[PDB]
Amino acid sequence: DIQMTQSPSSLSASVGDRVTITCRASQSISSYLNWYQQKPGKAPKLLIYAASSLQSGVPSRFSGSGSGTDFTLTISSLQPEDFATYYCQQSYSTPLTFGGGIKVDIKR
Amino acid sequence: QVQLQESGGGVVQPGRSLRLSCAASGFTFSRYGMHWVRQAPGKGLEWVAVIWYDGSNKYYADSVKGRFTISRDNSKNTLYLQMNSLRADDTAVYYCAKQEGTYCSGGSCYSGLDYWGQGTLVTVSS
Amino acid sequence: TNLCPFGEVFNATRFASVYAWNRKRISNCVADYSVLYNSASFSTFKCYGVSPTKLNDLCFTNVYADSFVIRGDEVRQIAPGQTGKIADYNYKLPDDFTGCVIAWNSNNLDSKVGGNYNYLYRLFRKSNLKPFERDISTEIYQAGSTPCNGVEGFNCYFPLQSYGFQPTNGVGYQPYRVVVLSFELLHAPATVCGP
Ligand SMILES: *[C@@H]1O[C@H](CO)[C@@H](O)[C@H](O)[C@H]1NC(C)=O
């Protein structure tokens, strides 16, 4: 199987700053990566598919890039509504595997 | 107004079976592959099973292989999961997910999940 | 009021191989189709389902642009219900396909003296491809009953083979650039109208 590693599992940022998240793989999955948000008690919903493609309705500030085994996700403008848990998924071959996830919190 | 709705969750004693359904509305069901995801209470997301658009190929995770069976009835716009020999580690919230793109959607009939259900809670206990 | 980018799919410096064809997303635009249809520069322009003749007054949820390069004699294979190496192993279209296929000669760019071998196609496979499937595996193909053990010996073949493109070949052996526009209509945005 392909293990998808997501670290660090926690992150702290303040409104107006730039946030970057990294997801790692174990084999070659080309560009079959997806990024998901999730707020407590809610369904995930998709942000970026194919590792670089935005979904309709996502504000034009989320940006994703990366090919091969290492990937990244960027926000570039932290809004009060951008505090959730982010997951990365691979869709190259079965069994499809999720990452551990990272949580972003408020800094005081 | 694309919508997915799951049903079947509840409590069950260990060693028994259960059945879950998800119904879709707002798109052409027969052109898309479908996935099952679960999330344990307090834990992360775990992928469960996948079925293709025409139902030819079926795949499951190793933690549920030999016990879980996935199927689709796209003449009635529905997707089914059958859970057999349930243990206490199967307690989770289950989501039915629709993948982005038609048919194989650009690679090996797997792609990202752009529409999700609200999920149903399944707890195995006595 | 921003027009769609079609010089990024048509006027592209590099195209992709047929086994690894490239896909682009186009949305939130004012796409104009009269420029493409009335350019008098494309040899093949065939639309299935929709009528090209002045139907630029429709709205769609999303537009997929799939582009690649093949040889001329195989251009007829990029169509619903077609058979051959390209249709079975490299690129497949659904039977109920709605969308347009545009193909034009690319001899002046994709043909080189001595042969341009940068384009590849799959020659063998265990089974046929599904619609819009994409295989990039390099596992060697076994034509026999004895395991190949990862070596290309007897009944063990490399499934990918390269085209040979030269400027002096006939029209059936000359390169052709192919773009397929596929239209998806979902129950929410209908964001691709293009007045
Ligand atoms: C591509 O380039 C040609 C050459 O300048 C130009 O006429 C045309 O408008 C461009 N775009 C398309 C879609 O052909």
C136/A56 CB distance under 8 A: no
Q: Are residues C29 and C49 in the same domain?
A: yes
Would you say B94 and B9 are in contact if contact means Cβ atoms under 8 Å apart?
Answer: yes
For residue B45, which amino acid is it? L
The count of domains in chain C is 2
Dist CA C111 CA C119 (whole Å):
11
- Collapse the DSSP code of C183 into the 3-class scheme (helix H, G, I; strand E, B; otherwise coil) and give the result: strand
Q: Are residues C94 and C146 in the same domain?
A: no
Provide the resolution (angstroms).
2.1
B108/C134 CB distance under 8 A: yes
| CB of C195 closer than 6 angstroms to any ligand 1 atom | no
Whether chain C has a CB inside 8 Å of the CB on B111: the answer is no
First-to-final CA distance of chain B: 40
| CB of C37 closer than 6 angstroms to any ligand 1 atom | no
CA B48 to chain A, closest CA, distance in angstroms equals 8
Q: What is the full DSSP assignment across A62-90? A: -EEE--TTEEEEE-SS--TT--SEEEEEE
| Number of other residues whose CB lies within 10 A of the CB of residue B29 | 20
CA dihedral C128, B111, C159, C44 (to 10 degrees): 70
First-to-final CA distance of chain C: 10
Ligand 1 centroid to C33 CA: how many Å?
13
Q: Are residues C69 and C104 in the same domain?
A: yes
Q: Are residues C103 and C119 in the same domain?
A: no
Which helix (H) or strand (E) segment holds residue C175: the answer is strand C175-184
The secondary structure of residue C165, as a DSSP letter, is: B
Please report whether residue A46 resides in a domain: yes
For every residue of C149-160, which 3-state class applies, written as one string? CCCCCCCEECCE
Please report whether residue A69 resides in a domain: yes
Minimum-distance ligand 1 atom for the alpha carbon of C9: 13
- Collapse the DSSP code of A37 into the 3-class scheme (helix H, G, I; strand E, B; otherwise coil) and give the result: coil
The count of domains in chain A is 1
Dist CA B51 CA B45 (whole Å):
19
* Maximum pairwise Cα distance, chain A: 42
Residue with the smallest CA separation from ligand 1 atom 3 is: C11
Q: Are residues C9 and C71 in the same domain?
A: yes
Q: Which residues contact A97 (CB under 8 A, 6 or more apart)?
A: A1, A2, A3, A4, A89, A90, B47
**3-state SS of chain A: helix, strand, coil percent to 5?**
0, 40, 60
Please report whether residue A108 resides in a domain: no
Please report whether residue A16 resides in a domain: yes
Would you say C182 and C64 are in contact if contact means Cβ atoms under 8 Å apart?
Answer: yes
Query: Chain B residue with minimal CA distance to A56?
Result: B114
Would you say C111 and C69 are in contact if contact means Cβ atoms under 8 Å apart?
Answer: no
Would you say C65 and C11 are in contact if contact means Cβ atoms under 8 Å apart?
Answer: no
Please report whether residue A18 resides in a domain: yes
The count of domains in chain B is 1
Phi, psi of B30 (to 5 degrees): -70, -10
Range of the domain at B55: 3-124
Range of the domain at C159: 115-166
C27/A56 CB distance under 8 A: yes
Q: Is C27 exposed, middle or buried (0-12, 13-18, 19+ CB in 10 A)?
A: middle
Q: Among residues A73, A82, A89, which one has the least CA distance to residue B100?
A: A89
Would you say C163 and C117 are in contact if contact means Cβ atoms under 8 Å apart?
Answer: yes
Whether chain A has a CB inside 8 Å of the CB on C191: the answer is yes
CA C108 to chain A, closest CA, distance in angstroms equals 31
Of B26, B104, B108, the CB nearest to C131: B104
CATH code where residue A99 lies: 2.60.40.10
Residue corresponding to tokens 């996700």 = A73
A57/C189 CB distance under 8 A: yes
Q: Which residues contact C181 (CB under 8 A, 6 or more apart)?
A: C63, C64, C65, C99, C100, C102
